[PDB]
Design a protein around this ligand. Structure first.
Ligand code: HEM
Ligand SMILES: C[C@@H]1NC(=O)[C@H](Cc2ccc(O)cc2)NC1=O
Length: 394
């Protein structure tokens, strides 16, 4: 006798487990057990993942309901799960979207200058260099401080809450509340600070005193700051780190992108498609009885949308494990989700990776792992798959 198949399958972000394709072919919708002991429906084909993400009756908001089957414990107050919904209801969607665009004056130049400075520092110190701790993560942090309009010196401390804030835990985390309350207080102080007049916090600070937003709570304004910093920094830092691994393991692609940097945007779209950065399926709670393939999902049940299931589906992306720069459907992947909850920072996430990669190939064209790939230490019980250190030589 064996127990029900458990999720996640592996914390390794450098290879996709053989189990994914086997599930996708035989049972693209099947029952699994999460770390909390709850049962869930794991969805692994492109067709079914898109069906679930395009149907609002599979609710993100309802995953926070008391007594619901859970993928993991909340690291934020339950109302924060409905973050975008709260921003939309406050009439703040357009303002937040405009503040997080990579097209702001001098922002891409700031990204290039920051990427170049970080790399020059690594070259001066000499090999081995750690590309996560000393390149990808400081670059993500520096970008988000600039986008938020907060001092660059405040970035490292806000960053330090992240190894706990984005844990995928079976039980509540006391440290997550300590850090959350402290970071909310920091953001409340930013709103009241007269020096903060640019970026997202500068804009929220002015909307806060505008009569058309007088009834929006100060709780929501601080929340926007903490959530966009956290989600953006963890997502861009983790994606860039694992995209660099995908690139290092493909010297032919690395040489082509160095020779023809105009192909970098098409390269990043493929790096996004094959990315294993999300450690768990995206969770949704059924608010009705809905047919998904061969299964009638019952109201109150948890559904997990496996992004790599969709992104490595041979029926949508032929030869899925291969990076191909001339696919007819390049942006049709689910790396940024789909539907109601499509990533609001997708444009900024793309630009961060494109600039980071462009600067790396120019400064370190001979970049290679300084350790056998099996020596990378993969972070466990976390919302992202990331190596603790990324040792390289050049
Ligand atoms: C490579 C970069 C990124 C990747 C791969 C990524 C991926 C995702 C994915 C897949 C979702 C959907 C989650 C779901 O439907 O359950 C999501 C949502 C979100 N992302 Fe991104 N993201 C990235 C960068 C960013 C950036 C730069 C920001 C902000 C500055 C950001 C802010 C958010 C927020 C706030 C949501 C929640 C949307 C909602 O609840 O409706 N992301 N992201
Ligand atoms: C996903 C949902 N929306 C949010 O904005 C925050 C912040 C967030 C955004 C994207 C993530 O991958 C994680 C958290 N919390 C939530 O529970």
């Amino acid at each position: 006798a064996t127990v029900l198949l458990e999720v996640p399958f592996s914390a390794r972000g450098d290879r996709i487990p053989d189990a994914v394709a086997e599930l996708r072919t035989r049972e693209p919708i099947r029952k699994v057990r999460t770390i909390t002991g709850a049962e869930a429906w794991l969805v692994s084909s492109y067709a079914l993942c898109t069906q679930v993400l395009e149907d609002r009756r599979f609710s993100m908001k309802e995953t926070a309901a008391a007594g619901a089957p859970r993928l993991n414990a909340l690291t934020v107050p339950p109302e924060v799960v409905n973050n975008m919904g709260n921003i939309a209801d406050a009439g703040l969607r357009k303002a937040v979207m405009k503040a997080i665009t990579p097209k702001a004056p001098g922002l891409e130049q700031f990204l290039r200058d920051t990427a170049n400075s970080l790399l020059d520092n690594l070259i001066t110190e000499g090999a081995p260099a750690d590309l996560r701790n000393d390149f990808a993560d400081p670059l993500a942090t520096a970008l988000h401080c600039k986008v938020l309009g907060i001092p660059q010196e405040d970035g490292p401390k806000l960053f330090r809450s992240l190894s706990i804030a984005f844990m995928s835990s079976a039980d509540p985390i006391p440290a997550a509340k300590i850090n959350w309350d402290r970071d909310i207080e920091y953001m409340a102080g930013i709103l009241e600070n007269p020096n903060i007049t640019t970026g997202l916090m500068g804009e929220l600070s002015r909307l806060r005193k505008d009569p058309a937003y007088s009834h929006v709570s100060d709780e929501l304004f601080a929340t926007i700051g903490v959530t966009f910093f956290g989600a953006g920094v963890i997502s861009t830092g983790s994606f860039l780190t694992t995209a660099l691994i995908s690139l290092i393991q493909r010297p032919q692609l690395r040489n082509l992108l160095h020779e023809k940097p105009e192909l970098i945007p098409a390269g990043v779209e493929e790096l996004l498609r094959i990315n294993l950065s999300f450690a768990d399926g995206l969770p949704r709670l059924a608010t009705a009885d809905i047919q998904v393939g061969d299964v009638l999902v019952r109201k109150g049940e948890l559904v997990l949308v496996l992004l790599e299931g969709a992104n490595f589906d041979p029926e949508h992306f032929p030869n899925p494990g291969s990076i191909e720069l001339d696919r007819p459907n390049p942006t049709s992947h689910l790396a940024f989700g789909r539907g109601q909850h499509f990533c609001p920072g997708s444009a900024l996430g793309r630009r961060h990776a494109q600039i980071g990669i462009e600067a790396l190939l120019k400064k370190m064209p001979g970049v290679d792992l300084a350790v056998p790939i099996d020596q990378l230490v993969w972070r466990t019980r976390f919302q992202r798959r990331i190596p603790e250190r990324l040792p390289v030589l050049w």
